[PDB]
Amino acid sequence: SELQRKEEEMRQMFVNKVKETELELKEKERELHEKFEHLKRVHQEEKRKVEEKRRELEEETNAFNRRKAAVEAL
Amino acid sequence: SELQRKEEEMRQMFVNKVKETELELKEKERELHEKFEHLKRVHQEEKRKVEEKRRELEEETNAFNRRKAAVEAL
Numbered sequence: 001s002e003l004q005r006k007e008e009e010m011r012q013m014f015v016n017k018v019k020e021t022e023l024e025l026k027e028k029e030r031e032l033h034e035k036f037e038h039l040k041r042v043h044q045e046e047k048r049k050v051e052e053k054r055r056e057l058e059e060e061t062n063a064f065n066r067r068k069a070a071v072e073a074l
Numbered sequence: 075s076e077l078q079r080k081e082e083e084m085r086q087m088f089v090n091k092v093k094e095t096e097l098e099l100k101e102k103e104r105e106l107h108e109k110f111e112h113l114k115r116v117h118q119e120e121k122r123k124v125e126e127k128r129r130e131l132e133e134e135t136n137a138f139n140r141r142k143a144a145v146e147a148l
Contacts, residue, residue, distance in 0.1 A: 018131050
């Protein structure tokens with residue numbers, strides 16, 4: 001009767017609240033994927049930055065070795 | 075002569091400074107690897123946390139569907 005009417009809209013009111021929360025976690029589940037692919041790019045960028053500074057220093061020792069070799073050849 | 079003595083210790087003083095900086099970048103290059111493997115674990119942990127909350131909600135809808143089905147069977 002009228003008791004089953006209220007026992008239907010309430011039984012769906014909880015479902016509608018779970019379906020909404022179930023969907024937000026799904027959206028946050030792809031949001032942490034985007035935030036993780038971002039840090040993978042920042043990591044790969046910061047790595048290449050340091051990897052070329054060591055190449056920018058490997059050539060400074062060579063330049064100093066050529067300055068030393070150019071003098072010892074006299 | 076004495077000019078080449080100072081032109082030797084100075085030529086090595088710059089090298090010793092580059093070799094020190096070249097090594098720090100190498101140590102920081104593995105430090106960003108450890109800091110990146112850490113966030114990969116935090117990401118994989120936070121993912122599994124959300125992935126089971128949606129399984130903790132998928133069973134709440136089933137429990138409510140069984141409560142609804144148990145009444146309609148009367």
